[PDB]
Structures are given as structure tokens and as C-alpha cells.
A = this chain, B = another copy of it.
């Protein structure tokens, strides 16, 4: 029993973290095979960040202007290339700790673990969801850029996020490992706003199934609803519309508990309209939306890596 926000074990990713310095700017890099990936703004001075021309700035940089350190050991840089918002530094040594890996661009609503680093050294690990507005609710300070987000499927690490910036609301933005931002964000120090932050309905439903499996079931009411009637309610509370694809992904949890997805929708509708009346669900006084159906199954079944 019990249900906690759980991150993947970080060991495979810890062995890939390096420190990248260009001039006076230092941040984290990810060393896989003979390439180090890092945010391209490592080449900026604080002034350049206000309105950078990355192509012009990078032209003043040679391989010897990038200092890459793994622990106390220096890596020799033998090439450099800019791919979208990431810089790729070719080094003369393949990382001996390179895990089996792939680069994935995740969909909004999916979750991943973040290994927060400073100066190439891991500080901690936490779980994040890619929100529908393509921001994450992270915890990052100066020097955190280059910290990565990932998922594990037994022995394969799927890297999906690299940290680049913080928006005025305190939420975070970054790119996939090809350097393409999630969302409309640009790597420039100018006012940018994320857009309306909607709730991931299929994740709230998965978390209510997690609650039932854990014996927390006071909220189960005597009503049912339809997809269109539920969505009329959900859109009023800034919830994402629920589709048959979402009902299908909830299939294993609905089958395990015997509770039809539309019956759970009707319980969610009552919780939205009436609130929780001072009660809690899985130790929370709010409806939690950062657990995917996969996270609930995995945790309630003990999937290992």
C-alpha cells in the first residue's frame, strides 16, 4: 500500500553528467558515446542573453574555448556543432558509462524524472509532468541548465528534456535532446508567458483509481455520466477534454477495480462542483494530475528496471 510521487533510479544518468564551461559561463552537459550535449546559451555573456544572435556568437568560438570536465578529468573537444538550441561537442573519448539510450520528444501530459545538477554534479531527483502548456513545475537555480529529464524502460534510458529557463510564473521550460523547445519558448531573456495551465484529466482519473486501489474511496458516488456531459463540466474548470483514447488507456485500471471510466468521471464531476469538503485523497487536499495511467500501474504492480 501507499502511493508516492516516485522518480526512476538515477544511476544510469548520473554516469553521463559532465560540466561544460565556455568563458565565464558554466552549466551541465550530457555525455553519451563521444558527444556532449548542452544548452547553446553556454556561449553567452549575461549581456548576450538579452538579445543573442547565436550563429554570430558561436562563430567566435573554437573547440579549445569549450572546457568539458567529468569529475576532475578534462575531456578533449575535437568538434562542435549547433543543432537548434543545443550545442553538440565532439570529444575524443566515448563515455565508458554510456547506458543503452534513445532520444524521445514526449507528449503533453506524460511524466519523466529530472536529475537536477550543478557544475556537472547531481543534486537530486524528482518527477515532473510535461504540462499541456509545455512547461514543467520544477525546482531549478542558477547553473541548473543542462540538467536532463528521462524515463527508463528496463535497461534503456529515454532522454526527453534538457533544462534551459524559468518563466515569470516560476515554471520551467526547455528542449528535447535535438534542441527543439517544448512550447513556444525561445532561449532569450525577454518577457515570455506560458499560456493557460490546463489540468491533465486522464491523469486525475488514473490517480482516483490509485486512491481506490489504496482503499481511499469516500468520493465514489452513485452517478454515471457521458463523455460529452463530463467534457462540458471539465472545460469550465480548465480540464483537458477526455477522449475514447484516454478511456482506453485507463482500461487496465478500470478492469482492475471494476469501476467504469464514465462512473469515475461522474465522481470527478462531483469533486469539481462540490470540492473535497476538507477531506483528502492519498494525502492530498487537491486533485493530483502528475501521475499518468502508466505511473499508477507501474507503482501498484512493482515494475522494476
Interface residue ranges, A against B (CB under 8 Å): 1-12, 14-15, 115-119, 121-126, 137-144, 166, 170-172, 214-215, 275, 278, 280, 283-286, 298-305
> Which residues of chain B are within 8 angstroms of A139 by Cβ–Cβ distance?
1-4, 6, 299
Q: How far, in whole Å, are A115 and B275 apart by their CA atoms in the complex?
A: 35
Contact in complex: B11, A15 (CB < 8 Å): yes
Q: How far, in whole Å, are A117 and B275 apart by their CA atoms in the complex?
A: 36
Q: How far, in whole Å, are A73 and B116 apart by their CA atoms in the complex?
A: 33
Contact in complex: B285, A144 (CB < 8 Å): no
Q: How far, in whole Å, are A139 and B286 apart by their CA atoms in the complex?
A: 20
Contact in complex: A304, B117 (CB < 8 Å): yes
Contact in complex: A9, B137 (CB < 8 Å): no
> Which residues of chain B are within 8 angstroms of A141 by Cβ–Cβ distance?
300-302
Q: Which of B215, B298, B301 contacts A170 (CB 8 A)?
A: B215
Given contacts A2-B137, A139-B299, A170-B215, 7 further A-B contacts (CB under 8 A): A6-B126, A7-B124, A9-B115, A9-B125, A123-B302, A141-B302, A285-B286
| A123-B303, A124-B9 given; A170·B286 CB < 8 A | no
Q: How far, in whole Å, are A239 and B301 apart by their CA atoms in the complex?
A: 35
Copy number in the complex reads 2
| A7-B7, A170-B215, A286-B280 given; A305·B122 CB < 8 A | yes
Contact in complex: B304, A123 (CB < 8 Å): yes
Query: Can you name the residue of chain B whose Cβ is closest to the Cβ of A141?
Result: B302
- Shortest distance between the CB of A114 and any CB in chain B (Å): 8
Q: How far, in whole Å, are A302 and B166 apart by their CA atoms in the complex?
A: 16
Query: Can you name the residue of chain B whose Cβ is closest to the Cβ of A138?
Result: B2
Q: How far, in whole Å, are A113 and B117 apart by their CA atoms in the complex?
A: 17
Query: Can you name the residue of chain B whose Cβ is closest to the Cβ of A12?
Result: B11
Contacts A/B (CB < 8 Å), 26 sampled: A1-B166, A2-B139, A2-B172, A3-B139, A4-B126, A4-B137, A6-B116, A7-B124, A9-B115, A9-B123, A9-B124, A11-B15, A118-B302, A118-B304, A122-B305, A123-B302, A123-B305, A137-B283, A139-B299, A141-B300, A141-B301, A142-B302, A275-B278, A283-B286, A284-B285, A285-B286
Query: Can you name the residue of chain B whose Cβ is closest to the Cβ of A303?
Result: B123
Query: Can you name the residue of chain B whose Cβ is closest to the Cβ of A280?
Result: B286
> Which residues of chain B are within 8 angstroms of A304 by Cβ–Cβ distance?
117-119, 121-123
Q: List the 4 closest pairs (A to B, CB-CB), nearest first.
A: A11-B11, A285-B285, A6-B124, A121-B304
Q: How far, in whole Å, are A275 and B11 apart by their CA atoms in the complex?
A: 41
> Which residues of chain B are within 8 angstroms of A302 by Cβ–Cβ distance?
118, 123, 141-144
> Which residues of chain B are within 8 angstroms of A142 by Cβ–Cβ distance?
302
Determine which residue in A1, A144, A171, A298 has the highest number of CB atoms from chain B within 10 A of its CB, and name it. Answer: A1
